[PDB]
Design a protein around this ligand. Structure first.
Ligand SMILES: CCCCCCCCCCCCCCCCCC(=O)OC[C@H](COP(=O)([O-])OCC(O)COP(=O)([O-])OC[C@@H](COC(=O)CCCCCCCCCCCCCCCCC)OC(=O)CCCCCCCCCCCCCCCCC)OC(=O)CCCCCCCCCCCCCCCCC
Ligand SMILES: CCCCCCCCCCCCCCCCCC(=O)OC[C@H](COP(=O)([O-])OCC(O)COP(=O)([O-])OC[C@@H](COC(=O)CCCCCCCCCCCCCCCCC)OC(=O)CCCCCCCCCCCCCCCCC)OC(=O)CCCCCCCCCCCCCCCCC
Ligand SMILES: CCCCCCCCCCCCCCCCCC(=O)OC[C@H](COP(=O)([O-])OCC(O)COP(=O)([O-])OC[C@@H](COC(=O)CCCCCCCCCCCCCCCCC)OC(=O)CCCCCCCCCCCCCCCCC)OC(=O)CCCCCCCCCCCCCCCCC
Ligand SMILES: CCCCCCCCCCCCCCCCCC(=O)OC[C@H](COP(=O)([O-])OCC(O)COP(=O)([O-])OC[C@@H](COC(=O)CCCCCCCCCCCCCCCCC)OC(=O)CCCCCCCCCCCCCCCCC)OC(=O)CCCCCCCCCCCCCCCCC
Ligand code: HEA
Ligand code: HEA
Ligand SMILES: CCCCCCCC/C=C\CCCCCCCC(=O)OC[C@H](COP(=O)(O)OCCN)OC(=O)CCCCCCCCCCCCCCC
Ligand SMILES: [Cu+2]
Ligand SMILES: [Cu+2]
Ligand SMILES: [Cu+2]
Lengths: 139, 203, 46, 145, 312, 67, 552
């Protein structure tokens, strides 16, 4: 690729510009001082687009022109074998039930339900992430 | 059977390809890392105000803030960053055992970081502040305590991926999983470099 | 599919001839299991 | 070689992707959208107790009618057990023609009775209801195997 | 024409509100002058129907018109630039911040009703050497020398050394027009003075929104700590009479029940108001002493009951 | 005001406007074509309606009629 | 020479092909259908909640329901219209047609999209679950300001369930953000670069960017609020810095949340236009920059909601709110150029697009009229701001979602709708909506501030509340044609066999079957420009398509 690095570079330039101008315009011009609550949010949204754009630039330098990304590319130029997508899976519904039990334990302040919902989160997250790695039963 | 129709290296495939193709769980965890950086921006904004409020000698009187136990566990955690990166160097070159040794010792001294942070919380709550006791004590317990939840979730990812290395052949997809958990946890201990500069050094 | 990890330990690998012997023997035993069960199934109907 | 006369083109394989002008339709079947659902119910739901793909042909057959109906049974997607009905309102000709394996399965007394139960409703002026009263009769007639 | 074109304001009673209402009139002229030409564009490009004589031949197919795009990326920037300059020149005239006001009202704003202060009066006519009380501002600075443990900690307090349940921002006064749940609080204010409003809330954020001031501010709980310049002066108030005042954030349930009044009296009526309240009288008696109806006249103190289907 | 008016208004003007717009928009002829008149000749393309009834050439029989 | 087709397609489907396939979804298609279904169910829940509020405001007493139930009523209503109706559907149309538009076989993390949907639904149920609680749900508003939300204030269980329901819903929508941005980055057809993707997948690229920016601060704010309620944890303490500590970062979530609301519906409408204007989208690269030009500033504009607090840097946020009002004006004038000199037909999704154009116009005029702080100092939390965000936001999500449903309906279920019933739907969701919000401008300008359960007969303005009630109950019977239309357009209704049931389709989606196959594509077209379905279906057009694509 190339253009995601340029995209988050544009977002990085604007977020850094807005972060530093918000810090130096709430350093003066404000009632007490620097607001410290949208200032660091702007500094770390600059951090967000730094991470995404820096990783996409790291990939885009360590790569040729992708046969996907190439303008004037026939479909037969990039028709190989894609990677694994998951078929049918009943673990995300269990992820959501687990995280919802943990959330209603954290809402109705029930520490037993917090701990049990976190235990179901660990169990169902294991069931999701091992789902295409369980070997056959060795008997 | 006849032989198979899906005659591949495994049932699991890399994520697309990675010779002339970007790795897709890689970019997935990179943008989710960036989201969690905005979550920490929420926690940092809960810290950098309620420190402009308290004036004078502002870290309050019951907070004898221990640096002599803080900087060893930060040094443990950031050396453990290099152990985890050596684990992903031993993941690119495809051997599970070079992965598993460095991730076992990364999990062990990350657990040592979690136990050191827990002992710091015990030692700082039993003769000091509580989360309903102070402003600074509460923001110290949430800005680094939910970071404790981040690193304990990263430890869950370590033990989980280690069982995953136990149960299947080392595919390039599993090196993708290893590099993804590797720099998730590298993000965890670069956020902890930010938090340790913020809470203890800069104040 | 992909069910052949390193046989070594959780930390240290076993030498490669021992891995070859173990995975070839376990593969032949699983093949013998389904072979004996399949020929019994054919003995029931045939 | 000609595609659909505007907007269609054959794709990179043989599937010809066509269009539809935005207010217009695709099928243009000159029958209501609810009674041919009754036809599909009588021809799938209340037909599966006969084990034969009941084809229904409404187009013109302006030739020797039996031969040009048994010729267009050959593209019903399994021709050995199919009971096609052909009707030509240009020509006023019912023609029920069988497949091979449908033979002596309650069918030799059901084809003229199916033609009678259709043509009793065609002379009223109901095409779809004639087809429904024919396919229900031939479903009651053709016995499964 | 001027009231119906302004989308139905209430007309101003202070020069702040007059100048704000003039800027809204100009800005709805700008907004309708944008929306009229663009609804003209839509309801005239709905004259480009699919023509019946239009054969199998597509339109102009153009897209990508760069000079037209530069013109309509420069002209909305000019519209928002002139609207931003008029916005900032009216933003200069929202708090002139006069260090010499004429009457300061300490509008504190507790859970579900108001309380008005009369913190300081000083007429440029020459009258009212009146000030605020302040023995009542005692703290909750919990500087106890030892807590639950036995030695060493001397724990001082949660926020800035003090508890949240503190009330040291919350300034009080001798005169207090407290508003009960069956008597609407009636601030009265002299016509044609410089009326400063210092705003505090005991519990929770809400809004000092008189509709006819054409201005509001939020009573933040500790507004000095929360970077909130709560105070604002009102330049004059020309029109006398009574004016409604609502409550314009979220407080909790009894939130429409927080109405007040700012009854604008003559300056000699203000003389006879407070000089018939320094000799201590309540609100209805002080308003009856100045020949003016004592209860709230533009809002009734509506029902302490809860519905029209509760059994009384 | 006058609670019969401000209940009959908010309960009838939606139904009055619903009846007016549903009698000016649903009484149009839809996009679906008309039913086939039998006296008219068969203008349509030929139609075969198969069944897909058991899912996965030589002659079987015959019958005929003339309406 | 003749095919063997069924007379009508499958009406309902076989018994039992969906309810296990509910539980074990992995394609984007069925997940997106589930988003549209269960979120129109939450739209129904919210609509009846609003009709309860609007029965209440019709007469000046408390004649129908109480004060506290009203304060629960607008809050749960604002959430199941913003954070449980809009916020899901902005990824629900993504899971509908974004892998169709970029050439992707599936969405990139095909279990994590099921995880996004099911976390959404089980955050939404546990946030509605305040109504089972006896004190009810959150009486504080959707804005949820912190001296009212800390456990001294509004101490019930419904606020806590609200908090953790938005935690789960925010996590699920973050996960929708990551898998949509990874589809559009690195799961894409081999001939299309960054720029000849459709505009809708572009808007969801930048929308998922701003989801990742905004929503973790909702979860951070809200974990801080759950700690401040349950642990009593002094973060949002009012005598601390914690009432602008709510407002700064909550509205730093909130306005990027309303632009992740606004941008993919701009993408829907910008996909509606080139297939009914029978021509290019006007200034396509102008839109592809203008989405960034609004959305980057959406992050940095956040405090144009605290003009009333007097504690924000006021000219900075007013200037940047005018500066976020200009690129959406660019994005709008490109649409007016897109309808310009085309061969328009107003079959129903373009009719909803034009309704969106009119509503979002005069609402955005109230936007520039409202973002100037002296004109907001009377208008902050009046009904001018509530008619503003309805007359904008309803126009975006509701009109462009009906354009999206009546456009991507024959390609996500293979059957059309009734055009007459859809036009019925539009005209009494247009007349009714303007009846219930053209007057709340004049009802918030003269005094009636937001979130009031009653008012007075000695206060005036009763007639404007009853005409808003008339309009809102026209809008309450407005989706009887919509749910009747989809209810007799799935199991019945006019089928489509060939592609493009809307002619002159484009954007790489419309070059596959109207029930698309599992993994979306039997044949991809040779992608050459922004409209490759229009270039497959019209090969003779291409030289005329490019030879006059630059003048204007
Ligand atoms: C204060 C409180 C104190 C409490 C006091 C009282 C408590 C009593 C303590 C009891 C002591 C535990 C006894 C030992 C259990 C031994 C289990 C085992 O080793 O089997 C290995 C087994 C693999 O063997 P296999 O079945 O032959 O694998 C081939 C199959 O193909 C694989 O099967 P498959 O492919 O057909 O299906 C795959 C499925 C495999 O599913 C399972 O096998 C387990 C499901 C059991 C749940 C059934 C309930 C159904 C609910 C509806 O995948 C998963 O579900 C992954 C889940 C991973 C769970 C790990 C998280 C534990 C955290 C909990 C805290 O994997 C597991 O079962 C996972 C267990 C992980 C280790 C156990 C540690 C957790 C408990 C210790 C607490 C500390
Ligand atoms: C302050 C808070 C701080 C907290 C920090 C956060 C940490 C909490 C997160 C942990 C929970 C996450 C979810 C659990 C993951 C389980 C996934 C799984 O099912 O794996 C299946 C995977 C399947 O492989 P497979 O051969 O393809 O499947 C065929 C079956 O396994 C056929 O069965 P099999 O006969 O082949 O299985 C053999 C197994 C059969 O034995 C059992 O069945 C055990 C049953 C459960 C025991 C618990 C019950 C007794 C006590 C009850 C008390 C109740 C109160 O015997 C073994 O245990 C062999 C050891 C292999 C361990 C490899 C697993 C990953 C280890 C990660 C390394 C971490 C550092 C350890 C260093 C390693 C050595 C230097 O391997 C296993 O079967 C694992 C066995 C059970 C181990 C579960 C995880 C243990 C590690 C946790 C470390 C905790 C900290 C350590 C501190 C330092 C040492 C003190
Ligand atoms: C872009 C597209 C359009 C946008 C969406 C527009 C939406 C507007 C508003 C909604 C109105 C739309 C019309 C809806 C009627 C459907 C007519 C139709 O032809 O659709 C067939 C159409 C064709 O499907 P098929 O694969 O060919 O076969 C369907 C057969 O029925 C075979 O299916 P099955 O045998 O496998 O399972 C049958 C079962 C499967 O459905 C379910 O179990 C979930 C339904 C939840 C009902 C909760 C209501 C409260 O269906 C039912 O439950 C029927 C009872 C409905 C109760 C409602 C009571 C109202 C009074 O179905 C769809 O494609 C739509 C899928 C809808 C997904 C449901 C989303 C729910 C999310 C999870 C639910 C889990 C929690 C619920 C609690 C547990 C209790 C169930
Ligand atoms: C904050 C909330 C935490 C959410 C964590 C998950 C978000 C990550 C999403 C983007 C990252 C890449 C991704 O798409 O994951 C693929 C995968 C989606 O599978 P798929 O759609 O079929 O695509 C095939 C994979 O791409 C094929 O690639 P793969 O299967 O190799 O996936 C690579 C890798 C993916 O690696 C990672 O995503 C980094 C792991 C960071 C999560 C650790 C927890 C952090 C938060 C703790 C504080 C709250 O998977 C792993 O081996 C590590 C997964 C460990 C998840 C542990 C979650 C436990 C949470 C409870 C902790 C208890 C402490 C609190 C008390 O998602 C996951 O594996 C995570 C499960 C979702 C958990 C949500 C919890 C509610
Ligand atoms: C879909 C969601 C959505 C969108 C898109 C908007 C779009 C805008 N909103 Fe609205 N807004 C809300 C949902 C939206 N808002 C919500 C939910 C709230 C808060 C809820 C609450 O607090 O109660 C809100 C609160 C809100 C406030 C808060 C102040 C207050 O509480 O009183 C303000 C003012 O700053 C505001 C201004 C705008 C502006 C300037 C835009 C601009 O983007 C609009 C610009 C569009 C036009 C300008 C372009 C087209 C017109 C012409 C063709 C070209 C341009 C011509 C001009 C140059 C004159 N919005
Ligand atoms: C996302 C956009 C959106 C939408 C779609 C809505 C849907 C509606 N809203 Fe809501 N509204 C808000 C954005 C929206 N609102 C916001 C941001 C708030 C503020 C929250 C806060 O202030 O804290 C809000 C709260 C709110 C208020 C509160 C202000 C106050 O209390 O004074 C009002 C004013 O009356 C209002 C008017 C309406 C109307 C008329 C609709 C109509 O569209 C009505 C929709 C509902 C019906 C159309 C459904 C039909 C009924 C069904 C047929 C019943 C049967 C169904 C069952 C079988 C399940 N809305
Ligand atoms: C919601 C989650 C919000 C924040 C999590 C912060 C994690 C960091 C934990 C902070 C540790 C600390 O330092 O707590 C010190 C004080 C001690 O004070 P005491 O009891 O009055 O002393 C007695 C004197 N007589 O904590 C306390 O109040 C007691 C409670 C202990 C911590 C609360 C539980 C920790 C984990 C929360 C569960 C997360 C669920 C997530 C679900 C999605
Ligand atoms: Cu209030
Ligand atoms: Cu906003
Ligand atoms: Cu506000």
């Amino acid at each position: 690729m190339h253009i995601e690095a340029r995209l988050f570079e544009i977002l990085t330039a604007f977020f850094a510009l807005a972060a530093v101008v918000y810090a130096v315009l709430t350093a003066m011009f404000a009632t007490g001082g620097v607001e410290w609550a949208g200032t660091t949010a702007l500094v770390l949204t600059t951090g967000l687009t730094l991470i995404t754009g820096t990783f996409f630039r790291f990939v885009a330098r360590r790569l040729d022109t992708r046969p996907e990304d190439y303008e004037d590319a026939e479909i037969s130029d990039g028709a190989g074998e894609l990677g694994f997508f998951a078929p049918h899976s009943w673990w995300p519904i269990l992820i959501s039930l687990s995280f919802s039990t943990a959330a209603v334990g954290a809402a109705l302040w029930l520490p037993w339900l917090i701990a049990a919902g976190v235990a179901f989160v660990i169990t169902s997250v294991c069931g999701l992430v091992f789902e295409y790695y369980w070997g056959p039963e060795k008997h | 059977m006849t032989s198979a129709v899906g005659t591949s290296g495994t049932a699991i495939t890399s994520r697309v390809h990675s010779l002339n193709r970007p790795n897709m769980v890689s970019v997935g965890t990179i943008v989710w890392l960036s989201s969690e950086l905005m979550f920490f921006a929420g926690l940092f904004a809960m810290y950098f105000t309620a420190r402009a409020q308290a004036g004078g000698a502002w870290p309050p009187e019951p907070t004898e803030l221990n640096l002599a136990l803080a900087v060893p566990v930060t040094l443990v955690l950031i050396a453990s960053s290099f152990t985890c990166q050596m684990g992903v160097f031993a993941a690119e070159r495809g051997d599970v055992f070079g992965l598993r040794r460095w991730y076992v010792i990364t999990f062990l001294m990350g657990l040592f970081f979690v136990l050191g942070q827990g002992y710091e919380y015990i030692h700082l709550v039993e003769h000091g502040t509580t989360i309903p006791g102070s402003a600074y004590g509460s923001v110290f317990y949430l800005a680094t305590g939910f970071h404790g939840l981040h690193v304990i979730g990263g430890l869950v990812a370590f033990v989980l991926l280690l069982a995953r290395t136990k149960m299947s052949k080392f595919t390039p997809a599993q090196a993708t999983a290893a590099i993804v958990v590797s720099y998730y946890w590298h993000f965890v201990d670069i956020v902890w470099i930010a938090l340790f500069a913020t809470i203890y050094f800069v104040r | 599919s992909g069910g052949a990890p390193g046989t070594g330990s959780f930390l240290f690998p076993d030498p490669a001839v021992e891995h070859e012997a173990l995975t070839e023997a376990a593969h032949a035993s699983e093949h013998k299991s389904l072979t004996a069960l399949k020929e019994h199934q054919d003995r029931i109907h045939g | 070689e000609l595609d659909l006369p505007y907007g269609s083109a054959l794709t990179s394989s043989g599937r010809i992707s066509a269009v539809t002008e935005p207010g217009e339709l695709s099928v243009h079947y000159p029958f209501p959208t609810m009674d041919l659902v009754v036809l599909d119910d009588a021809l799938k739901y209340g037909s599966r107790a006969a084990k034969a793909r009941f084809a229904v042909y409404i187009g013109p057959l302006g030739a020797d009618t039996a031969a040009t109906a048994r010729e267009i049974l050959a593209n019903v997607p399994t021709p050995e057990n199919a009971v096609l009905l052909a009707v030509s309102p240009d020509q006023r000709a019912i023609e029920v023609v069988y497949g091979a394996d449908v033979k002596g399965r309650g069918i030799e007394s059901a084809a003229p009775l199916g033609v009678s139960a259709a043509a009793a409703s065609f002379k009223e002026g109901n095409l779809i209801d004639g087809l429904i009263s024919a396919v229900r009769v031939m479903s009651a007639g053709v016995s499964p195997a | 024409w001027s009231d119906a074109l302004a989308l139905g304001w209430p007309t101003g009673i202070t020069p702040e509100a007059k100048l704000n209402r003039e800027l809204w009139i100009g800005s709805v002229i700008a907004s309708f002058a944008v929306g009229a030409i663009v609804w003209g564009l839509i309801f005239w490009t709905s004259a480009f129907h699919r023509k019946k004589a239009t054969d199998t031949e597509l339109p102009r197919q153009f897209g990508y018109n760069m000079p037209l795009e530069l013109t309509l990326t420069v002209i909305p920037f000019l519209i928002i630039s002139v609207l931003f300059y008029f916005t900032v020149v009216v933003q200069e005239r929202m708090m002139h911040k006069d260090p010499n006001p004429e009457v300061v009202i300490d509008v504190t704003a507790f859970q579900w009703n108001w309380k008005f202060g009369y913190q300081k009066i000083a007429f440029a006519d020459g009258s009212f050497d009146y000030d605020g009380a302040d023995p009542e501002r005692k703290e909750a600075m919990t500087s106890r020398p030892e807590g639950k443990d036995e030695h060493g900690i001397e724990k001082v307090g949660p926020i800035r050394g003090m508890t949240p349940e503190d009330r040291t921002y919350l300034n009080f006064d001798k005169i207090e027009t407290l508003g009960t749940s069956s008597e609407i609080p009636v601030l009265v204010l002299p016509a044609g003075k410089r009326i400063e409003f210092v705003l505090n809330s005991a519990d929770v954020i809400h809004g000092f929104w008189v509709p006819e001031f054409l201005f509001k501010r939020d009573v933040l709980p500790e507004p000095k700590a929360n970077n909130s310049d709560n105070v604002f002066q009102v330049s004059e108030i020309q029109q006398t009479g009574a004016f409604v005042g609502r409550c314009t954030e979220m407080c909790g349930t009894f939130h429409a029940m927080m109405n007040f009044e700012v009854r604008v009296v003559e300056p000699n009526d203000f003389k006879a108001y407070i000089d018939q309240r320094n000799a201590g009288k309540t609100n209805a008696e002080a308003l009856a002493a100045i020949n003016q109806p004592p209860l709230a006249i533009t809002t009734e103190p509506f029902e302490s009951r809860r519905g029209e289907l509760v059994p009384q | 005001m006058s609670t019969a008016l401000t209940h009959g208004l908010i309960g009838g003007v939606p139904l009055v406007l619903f009846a007016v717009l549903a009698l000016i928009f649903l009484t149009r002829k839809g996009p679906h074509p008309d039913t086939y008149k039998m006296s008219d000749p068969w203008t349509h393309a030929p139609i075969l309606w198969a069944a897909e009834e058991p899912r996965e050439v030589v002659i079987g029989g015959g019958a005929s009629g003339k309406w | 020479e003749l095919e063997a087709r069924r007379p009508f397609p499958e009406r309902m489907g076989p018994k039992g092909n969906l309810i296990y396939k509910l539980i074990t979804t992995t394609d984007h298609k069925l997940i997106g259908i589930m988003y549209c279904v269960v979120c129109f169910a939450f739209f129904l829940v919210g609509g009846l909640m609003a009709l309860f509020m609007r029965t209440e405001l019709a007469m000046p007493g408390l004649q129908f329901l109480s004060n506290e139930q009203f304060n629960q009523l607008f809050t749960m209503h604002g959430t199941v219209m913003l954070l449980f109706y809009a916020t899901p559907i902005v990824f629900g149309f993504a899971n509908l047609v974004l892998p169709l538009q970029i050439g992707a076989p599936d969405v990139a993390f095909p279990r994590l999209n099921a995880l996004s949907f099911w976390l959404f639904l089980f955050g939404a149920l546990i946030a509605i679950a305040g109504f089972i609680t006896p004190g009810g749900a959150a009486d504080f508003g959707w804005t949820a300001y912190s001296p009212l939300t800390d456990a001294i204030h509004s101490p019930g269980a419904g606020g806590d369930l609200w908090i953790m329901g938005l935690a789960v819903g925010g996590l699920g929508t973050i996960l929708g953000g990551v898998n949509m941005i990874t589809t559009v980055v690195c799961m894409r057809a081999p001939g299309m670069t960054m720029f000849r993707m459709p505009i809708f997948t572009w808007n969801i690229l930048v929308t998922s960017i701003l989801v990742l920016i905004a929503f973790p601060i909702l979860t951070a704010a809200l974990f801080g609020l759950a700690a401040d309620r349950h642990l009593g944890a002094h973060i949002y303490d009012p005598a601390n810095g914690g009432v602008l500590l709510w407002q700064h970062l909550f509205w730093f979530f909130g306005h990027p949340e309303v632009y992740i609301i606004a941008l993919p519906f701009f993408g829907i409408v910008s996909e509606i236009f080139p297939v009914f204007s029978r021509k290019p989208i006007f200034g396509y690269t102008t839109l592809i920059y203008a989405t960034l030009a609004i959305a980057a500033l959406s992050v940095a504009v956040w405090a144009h909601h605290m003009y009333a607090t007097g504690a924000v840097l006021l000219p900075f946020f007013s200037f940047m709110t005018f500066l976020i009002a200009v690129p959406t004006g660019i994005k709008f004038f490109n649409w007016i150029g897109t309808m310009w000199k085309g061969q328009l037909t107003f079959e129903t999704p373009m009719l909803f697009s034009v309704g969106f154009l009119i509503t979002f116009l005069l609402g955005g005029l109230s936007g520039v009229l409202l973002a100037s702080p002296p004109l907001d100092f009377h208008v902050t939390d009046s009904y001018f701001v509530i008619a503003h965000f309805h007359y904008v936001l309803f126009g975006t999500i509701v009109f462009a979602t009906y354009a999206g449903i009546y456009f991507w309906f024959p390609k996500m279920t293979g059957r059309l709708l009734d055009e007459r019933l859809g036009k019925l739907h539009f005209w009494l969701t247009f007349i009714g909506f303007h009846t219930t919000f053209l007057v709340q401008h004049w009802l918030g300008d003269e005094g009636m501030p937001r979130r009031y359960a009653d008012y007075l007969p000695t206060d005036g303005f009763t007639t404007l509340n009853v005409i808003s009630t008339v309009g809102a109950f026209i809008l309450g019977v407005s989706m009887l044609p919509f749910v009747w239309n989809v209810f007799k357009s799935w199991r019945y209704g006019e089928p489509v066999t060939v592609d493009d049931p809307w002619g002159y389709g484009n954007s790489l989606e419309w070059a596959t079957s109207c029930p698309p196959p599992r993994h979306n594509f039997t044949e991809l077209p040779r992608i050459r420009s922004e409209r490759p379905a229009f270039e497959l279906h019209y090969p003779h057009m291409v030289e005329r398509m490019r030879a006059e694509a630059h003048v204007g």
